[PDB]
Amino acid sequence: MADQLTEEQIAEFKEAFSLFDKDGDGTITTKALGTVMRSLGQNPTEAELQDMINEVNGTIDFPAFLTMMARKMKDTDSEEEIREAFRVFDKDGNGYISAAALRHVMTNLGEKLTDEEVDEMIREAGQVNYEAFVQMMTA
Amino acid sequence: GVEIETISPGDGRTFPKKGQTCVVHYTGMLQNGKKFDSSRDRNKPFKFRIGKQEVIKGFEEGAAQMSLGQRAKLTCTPDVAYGATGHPGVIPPNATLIFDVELLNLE
Amino acid sequence: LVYYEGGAVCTHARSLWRLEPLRISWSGSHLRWGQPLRIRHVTTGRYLALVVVDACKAHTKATSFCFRVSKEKLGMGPPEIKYGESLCFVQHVASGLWLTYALKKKAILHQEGHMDDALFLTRCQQEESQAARMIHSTAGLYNQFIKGLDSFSGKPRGPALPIEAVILSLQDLIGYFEPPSEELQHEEKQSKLRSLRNRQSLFQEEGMLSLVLNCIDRLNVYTTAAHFAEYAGEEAAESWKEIVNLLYELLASLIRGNRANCALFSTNLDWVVSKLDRLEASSGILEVLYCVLIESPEVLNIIQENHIKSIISLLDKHGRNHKVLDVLCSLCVCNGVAVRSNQDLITENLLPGRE
Amino acid sequence: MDILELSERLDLQRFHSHTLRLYRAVCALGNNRVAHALCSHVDQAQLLHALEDAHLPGPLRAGYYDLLISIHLESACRSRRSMLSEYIVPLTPETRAITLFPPGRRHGLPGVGVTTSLRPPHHFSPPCFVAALPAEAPARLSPAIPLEALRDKALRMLGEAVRDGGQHARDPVGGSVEFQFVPVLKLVSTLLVMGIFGDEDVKQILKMIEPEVFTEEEGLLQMKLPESVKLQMCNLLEYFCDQELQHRVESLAAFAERYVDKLQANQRSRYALLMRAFTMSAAETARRTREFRSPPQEQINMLLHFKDDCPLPEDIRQDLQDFHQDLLAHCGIQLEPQSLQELVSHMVVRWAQEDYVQSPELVRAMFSLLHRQYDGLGELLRALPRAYTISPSSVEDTMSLLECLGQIRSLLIVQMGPQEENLMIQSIGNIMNNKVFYQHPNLMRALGMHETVMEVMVNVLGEIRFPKMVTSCCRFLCYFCRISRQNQRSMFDHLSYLLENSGMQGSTPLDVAAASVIDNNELALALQEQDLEKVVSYLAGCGLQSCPMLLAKGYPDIGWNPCGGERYLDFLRFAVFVNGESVEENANVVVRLLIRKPECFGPALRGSGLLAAIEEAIRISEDPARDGPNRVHLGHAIMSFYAALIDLLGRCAPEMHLIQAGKGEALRIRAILRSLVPLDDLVGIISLPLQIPTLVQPKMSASFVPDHKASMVLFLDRVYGIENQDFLLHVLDVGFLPDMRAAASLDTEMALALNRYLCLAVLPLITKCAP
Amino acid sequence: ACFRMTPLYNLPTHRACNMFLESYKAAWILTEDHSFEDRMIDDLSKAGEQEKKPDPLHQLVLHFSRTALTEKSKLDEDYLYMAYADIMAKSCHLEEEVSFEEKEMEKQRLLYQQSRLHTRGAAEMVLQMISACKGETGAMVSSTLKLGISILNGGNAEVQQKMLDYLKDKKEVGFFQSIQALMQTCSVLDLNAFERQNKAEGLGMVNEDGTVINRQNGEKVMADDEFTQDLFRFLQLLCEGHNNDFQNYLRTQTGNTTTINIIICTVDYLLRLQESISDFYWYYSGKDVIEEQGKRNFSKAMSVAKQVFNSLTEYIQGP
């Protein structure tokens, strides 16, 4: 799903891609793919370069370029989302969220979870930490 | 095969130079006489730049061979324009063309 | 050979059978059980004997059949045999041999029988059955007319073919196939059309299209209307001009409107266009080409530049006929879809001469 | 001879009438290369002269008018009428000042004012015949004609005709009242849909219809008209009700950007007051479910509930209802003839009282107009899914997109030839790098773009005529299906048609169907059963016959299909395995159906040894005479096919937690898959050594790959299982420590074909059995 | 991901307007009611009065009859006819402790609006298009049956007498076959898509700012419900006044060539319903309690069962 990127990145990507576009076709060389990411500050080595082209002839087209841009920014946000997800629980922001302050924040979020499952969330997990909570949520 | 026969003389001294535009109120025929084109019916003074080969070769070679305000009858040979195939739909293959032009202004 | 089939040949002209008991008088009395009868195919005119056979070699000893319910060791009529309910078989009255199968399940008189010879009858329809027997009446004349022509097909002249018999027989067929009027009421016009859609599909399926195509191609070879008609003589020579024109009117009356029969000319399209300058019935063939090029759009894009150059050559030798501009107006588009290959073959040929 | 003599010639009138049908039919449906070619034969002035020479006969007047639009005003006509049904409004401040009623409850004039919906310009090109011929040409535009001169002439000929018709003259222009108006309305109607009239011009046109109503002579509607002239009145009036509707939508788009700019500051001030409120905790989260816990789609649904529990103040909740009463009164609901819908509903019904109309076209165009006025609310509703709203910084690329959209719809109606194919590919290749196709996937779905590219794949498949086209279309759909999930939801709906044409190199229509069901539990759960049995019936063919293209290539003969049959199992392994998990309801019905035709399995196990089948493959792959002799080697496809039959059934293995329960159905399947395959056949396959590259590189597509081993390890680790320590250590030294130190040797091409194989297939299975 | 949801003021304003239209139409415009369906049909009927010609309404159903008689294989889905099928249907639903007299005027005003259609030939239009369906259970045969009920609602008599003669002068085999075709394509309770819905019901909100549209999936089990109830409700209303000729017509089309005996065909759907409801018992015969979705399915199947027993007994209410 290519929707996980916001607009201005694609605006920045197309600005970067058209800057190194070969003839305006939207084709670039295999080398220029490395240079254009380092033109965007991203510095992956040839290991992260090699597996991406064979995932998709030396001719990189702009949708074929963009689908690789989705996956490189999908994995990084997938792990940094869950610590800031725990930030709203604890009043301080460290990881010390009291279990008393959970059974009204969890029945009031909008996935329509009733009292039985937020119970079932808890007794199959005092204040619990964050890293056990990112373990008990991802499962 | 660019035969210019005059119809009315112009200035006699002003000639179009290269890198320049012209305005021609032309019309054309075939050797049978059937009028395949005009410009006055479209009420538009047709313009073009000389040298850049926008028109066919028999046209611009006739064009610089005129004076400003002159009226000339041209005769472009088959080999100078639309030689083998001709225009699609309009001009038949190996057709000799007959023109009536007039340099309006601008050299 | 007798066969079986699904539903496609169930409706058509072949699967129509009529019963003929041995007694002459009161033959249309109610048939009862244990009654001897003959079996007639209507289109071929052959008699079923388990093969079908000609009437001249159909004998009461050879072919005489009967309707029995099941083989226990055994004016008008009483109403014995119901419709759709009797479920009775056939066997020979001299042999007792049950006709049964072996998609073409070949029917054979078999002394073992089966559990599947319980077969139910269905009565046909009045307009269809009238259309049936005239096929036999025409094809018996037409193949007689073809081989009558084939006799002197190579031998010049320094039996008599049926000239007057065939002229009247076509003209009834034209009025048989005549399309209904536009001034008719709409609900009845639509009803009469679907009758006509059957009884031209009912002809072109059971032969009668190529059979008409044959008697053209035995006749078209005599382009001199009298000199090459002198292979017959002077008798048939005076009527040669008529018999061609009536023939193309029949064929044009066949494929009018119908899409399915119009695809039957996708193979011999070049057979049609090759006879456009034939100088006899020039309107006739041009009529046939116009009705085929408006019903089935697949015949458009199978046309090359050699065909269009004949049609413009037809217009240049037959005056300013306004029908020729119709067939070129059908050649551009089909079903709201244009053909860019055909829209330039006309233009760079017709227009640029301006003459 | 003079052309007016055709009025009594009556034969060359007809033959010159039917010539005009040939002229309109040749330049028909946007054939614009030939449209210049006719502009020689019938000049520009003599066509404009023939529009008003009243002494022309009957059928020759309706020719020279209809010739004119068919060479000048048709190629632009269809493309703009196509973009009328959709409404794309930008946020300029000119848009921002648009109301329903004009300021001054007096209903405004229809079609008069300012509209802002995007439409492409027309791109006419002037005709010439002395320009030199180049050469494939890109395209030819429609040949031009001066429009600002044309609108004054067309208005004048209408303006006399409504005035001269009141005189009731015995000699009408062109021989009837029918020919006096039908070739002047259908030009004015097609200059009104192209929008080239000024508003003061259509102010005059409103006077010329019924001046008693539309004023800020006798009216045209009161005039007795024959039946066909009523028809063009409907096609004239149908433009006007749409200009009421497109103005209404552009009014509501102007209302919203004034409204949601007022709504965001209300929320962010309310949230900051929520951010400083500590007076409650159990009721605070009931105020916090909306702020960051709900999705923004659910916010607006919750915010807009105050008709008859809303966090909005009474000040900005009433003006919406004040706006809502401004709209129903703008429509036909009085909501307790000086109106357009009052005029039409009078006029159309009175036309039925005039006579018994026989032409079925007019009776459809009447009643469709009449229903449009009475359910004026529902007329607004059905257009609103085609309403979309974009940013004003995106307009400079959006209209560049729409022109590249229009060439496709022009190619919808022409039978495809070898030139416009190169127009279609160059079109599509210019869509997929236009940057707005991605950032608004609702809009691309709203314009029916995903529908349009399907039908041009329909017409080509009906032997393949144009294969280079059909790849780039199905490549576009595969790149379309992963833009948003709901776009994949839409493309899913054409599955049975896509399935009917599974029947080569490059992409395929079937990979469209594969990318329509991937990565989504919703579709995979909703996948039909009848849509499954078609997939195995094409799998029922490949095991019995060969590839006819391969024996045409001079390859050795193999009675089944190691290359063609693998184009279904890669689909079906997306049909039961999603998100790294197996489904249940599809897995329990694919294997019940896969065993009804046991020919669908590979015939070496239908039987020879499974390791022996791959052993039978190594000889025919290493020997070039038994190999296929160029891109297709038979030995590389047989091991690849059995790499597909294995890992499919591994991905239909019921999951472990259902085996811990006593689900007898779920363990019935786990019996069958274990019953089919011997375990020790896998062990010789899992342990066979490979041609490691060193000093030379072997060929990937003719030899053993690590992806052949990757299918087998998934089968044993999902249906057979590693139980005891000895059988763990049984296959351990034989298979992988040969390969591990072969991999540790090269610390290169197949080194990276095997590095990812180890890190994704076996090193998990080791860590499954590490205690 | 439910916690990282961005607020509205962080969004760009054009997307904020987009979800508003999907909301504002959903909560305001769709909810709006109006009664234009009666103030149309009067002036299409009254305008025959002016200063043997057909009425404006009478012209219309003649035109819809003409498009139903042209020979085509399928029946093309016209949106315009469906736009007029419901409007004429709602002309009778306004009338479709009380006194004795006041319900008779509530009855007879329904026979007024029923007369306002079926003297203009509305009875045979709705009889032709069922023969023009030939079994294609699309959206039009939904919208054509709601008109067929609102003419024969309350057990009108002469519309049946306007219908029997039409099936006796035409001998139209093809009606009854299309009747038999729609009968067999009536969904029943399954035991496979039911848990497919239930496994689908385990998801409440989809990732990335999307909502699981529960009406998009809807009821995958027995979405054929209100249609197949409506056909038997139409079929019940053909012998409501115990019109004994239809009791001998619906089992034997004796003028026709081929009988169908819908009475037997009504039995065979009932048997297919009978096992389908019984196997729904055996799934729940082990369970103790019943959840919410289990009853909504079972509420559906008996509501169509009460319709078909009522439609059964009107074949035999007359002796």
Numbering used by the authors:
A (entry chain L): 1 to 56, 61 to 129, 135 to 148
B (entry chain H): 1 to 107
C (entry chain D): 244 to 292, 299 to 323, 333 to 360, 372 to 427, 434 to 630
D (entry chain D): 1648 to 1751, 1758 to 1788, 1793 to 1873, 1923 to 2014, 2020 to 2047, 2091 to 2216, 2222 to 2262, 2267 to 2369, ...
E (entry chain D): 3634 to 3684, 3693 to 3737, 3750 to 3972
Per the authors:
The molecular target of diamide insecticides is the ryanodine receptor (RyR), a large ion channel expressed in the membranes of the sarcoplasmic and endoplasmic reticulum (SR and ER). RyRs govern the release of Ca2+ into the cytosol, driving multiple events, including muscle contraction. Diamide insecticides directly engage and activate insect RyRs, causing uncontrolled Ca2+ release, leading to tonic muscle contraction, paralysis, feeding cessation, and eventually, death of the insect. Therefore, we designed a series of insect-like chimeric RyRs that contain the diamide-binding pocket from Sf RyR and the remaining parts from rabbit RyR1 (rRyR1).
We solved a cryo-EM structure of chiRyR in complex with FLU. chiRyR was recombinantly expressed in HEK293 cells and purified to homogeneity. Since FLU is a channel activator, we reasoned that it may bind better to open channels and thus added a cocktail of RyR activators (Ca2+/Caf/ATP/CaM1234) to help saturate its binding. The pore is in an open conformation, which is expected with a cocktail of activators including FLU. The binding site is located at the interface between the transmembrane region and the large cytosolic cap of RyR. It is coordinated by several residues from the transmembrane helices S1-S4, including Lys4563, Tyr4564, and Leu4567 from S1; Ile4657 from S2; Tyr4791, Ser4792, and Tyr4795 from S3; and Asp4815, Gly4819, and Val4820 from S4 (rRyR1 numbering). Among them, Lys4563 and Asp4815 play key roles in sandwiching FLU by forming H-bonds from two opposite sides. Additionally, Arg4824 from the S4-S5 linker is also important in stabilizing the pose of the sulfide amine group via H-bonding.
